[PDB]
């Protein structure tokens, strides 16, 4: 229940500053701010930054609570794939402090985020299935990954040669018409892919050709010139009559 979670979080906004010292509230509120706002899918790096803030505030607390804190923050690195904060957190002296069994499996999960590599991602997916269960939202984290990692391997196969048959190039993604080619049709809409397909003979043609340069630089200036004469029509009719 997202609205009930935010309502419980909204009541904590004035609760943290109510008493004298939290002692830890806003830091915990930051982690709670990294849940509902993360469910809102606002910004992937800022929500991951709240886990870094909570991890700075998790020092000298109960270890079972601290050993499960890396479950959320290091698996949050899985969803993002571009936090840019990878080496900052895990290679610092504060994140290397945990030698426990559960965090050692999390240390390679933080390395699994640096891995990507769908050959390896689909492999370790079974080994990390236990940590996959602790994922607060199991679908969304790996759906945005699998959907993004889809074209990651697609831009590899479509890049080398200009035109490709649509049946074999979609055979590695295992199917054509149902979703892929419709998702690939959305790529022209998202501008990530410039090309056109062929339904009858099954050959995908890529063309970046058709520029727009001289034209909009002409007609759009004439549309402005329509304001030159119309505004001068006031001068015309005023001086004459």
């Amino acid at each position: 229940n997202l609205p009930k979670a935010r309502a419980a979080l909204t009541s904590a906004r004035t609760t943290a500053n109510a008493i004298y010292c939290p002692p830890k509230l806003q830091a915990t509120l930051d982690m709670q701010s990294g849940i509902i706002h993360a469910a809102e899918e606002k910004d992937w790096k800022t929500a991951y930054s709240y886990f870094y803030e909570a991890f700075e505030g998790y020092d000298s607390i109960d270890s079972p609570k601290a050993i499960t804190s890396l479950k959320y923050m290091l698996l949050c690195k899985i969803m993002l794939n571009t936090p840019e904060d990878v080496q900052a957190l895990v290679s610092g002296k504060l994140a290397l402090r945990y030698a426990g069994r559960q965090t050692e499996a999390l240390k390679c999960v933080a390395q699994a985020s640096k891995n990507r590599s769908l050959a390896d991602f689909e492999k370790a997916l079974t080994d990390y299935r236990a940590e996959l269960r602790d994922d607060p939202i199991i679908s969304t984290h790996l759906a945005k990954l699998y959907d993004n990692l889809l074209e990651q391997n697609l831009i590899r196969v479509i890049e080398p040669f200009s035109r490709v048959q649509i049946e074999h190039i979609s055979s590695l993604i295992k199917l054509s018409k149902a979703d892929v080619e419709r998702k690939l049709s959305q790529m022209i809409l998202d501008k990530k892919f410039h090309g056109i397909l062929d339904q009858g003979e099954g050959v995908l043609i890529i063309f970046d050709e058709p520029p727009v340069d001289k034209t909009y630089e002409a007609a759009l200036e004439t549309i402005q010139n329509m304001s030159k004469v119309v505004d001068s029509l006031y001068n015309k009719a005023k001086k004459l009559t």
Partner: protein
């Protein structure tokens, strides 16, 4: 004819891009210090519509005294 402007002048600029120096994550745990820094650094760098609204004119002044260290 004047300069474009400009051809600028002698000496030089930049040279600080070699990297690495210091990571800002050291103060990242506070968030009480960074919040005042975040408002005093990147927003004064390029931001436009937020100023004229509130009306506060951001100063350019930065004066560093106190060394050592």
């Amino acid at each position: 004819d004047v300069l474009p402007p400009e051809a600028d002048s002698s000496i030089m600029m930049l040279t600080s891009d070699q990297k690495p120096d210091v990571m800002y994550a050291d103060i990242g745990g506070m968030d009480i210090q960074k919040q005042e820094v975040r408002e005093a650094v990147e927003l004064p760098l390029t931001h436009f519509e937020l100023y004229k609204q509130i009306g506060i004119d951001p100063p350019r002044g930065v004066l560093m005294y106190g060394p050592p260290g």
